[PDB]
Paper text:
Pleckstrin is an intriguing platelet protein that appears to be involved in reorganization of the cytoskeleton, as well as attenuating various signaling pathways following platelet activation. On cloning pleckstrin, two internal repeats consisting of approximately 100 amino acids including 30 identical residues were identified at the N- and C-termini of the protein. The domain structure consists of a seven-stranded anti-parallel β-sandwich that is closed at one end by a C-terminal alpha helix and remains open at the other end, where several variable loop regions are located.
To investigate further the nature of the myo-inositol polyphosphate interaction with C-PH, crystals were prepared using recombinant C-PH and IP6, which permitted the determination of a high-resolution crystal structure. The resulting crystals were of exceptional quality and diffracted to 1.35 Å. Ins(1,2,3,5,6)P5 was bound to C-PH in the β1–β2 loop region (residues 253–264 and 277), making numerous interactions through all but one of its phosphate groups. This configuration is strongly stabilized through interactions with the side chains of R264 and K253.
Numbering used by the authors: 241 to 302, 311 to 347
Write the structure that this text describes.
């Protein structure tokens, strides 16, 4: 879990139970492929981490610039980028890491 950082930046993430959206900082690493997320300063312990090998990442039509990751074991993460370019860049990086 300590490798080179492939991409980082903030995204809004939906919580599972109450469905609110919160800004978190995300960091994608390889070997193994994982997406960790943090408090938006990136200063504290990670909040969580998503194992990406074999995941499905999909752009979701409209909340704007939505996309979803479903891990290989069927855990869903619903995310929103601040711009269409950032959704396109995150999907391409997760799809390449997921191989
Ligand atoms: O750990 P805290 O209390 O800050 O909670 C997160 C969300 O809980 P709430 O934001 O209090 O509703 C949470 O959403 P819901 O099920 O929407 O209540 C979300 O599932 C949970 O996600 P992870 O633990 O990362 O899976 C908590 O959100 P994060 O702080 O982004 O971790």
């Amino acid at each position: 879990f300590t490798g080179v950082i492939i991409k980082q930046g903030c995204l809004l993430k939906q919580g599972h139970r109450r469905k609110n959206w919160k800004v978190r900082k995300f960091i994608l690493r390889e070997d193994p492929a994982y997406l960790h997320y943090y408090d938006p300063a990136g200063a504290e312990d990670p909040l969580g981490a998503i194992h990406l090998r074999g995941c499905v990442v999909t752009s979701v039509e409209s909340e704007e610039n939505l996309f979803e990751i479903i891990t290989a074991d069927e855990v869903h993460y619903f995310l929103q980028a601040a711009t269409p370019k950032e959704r396109t860049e995150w999907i391409k990086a997760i799809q390449m890491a997921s191989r």
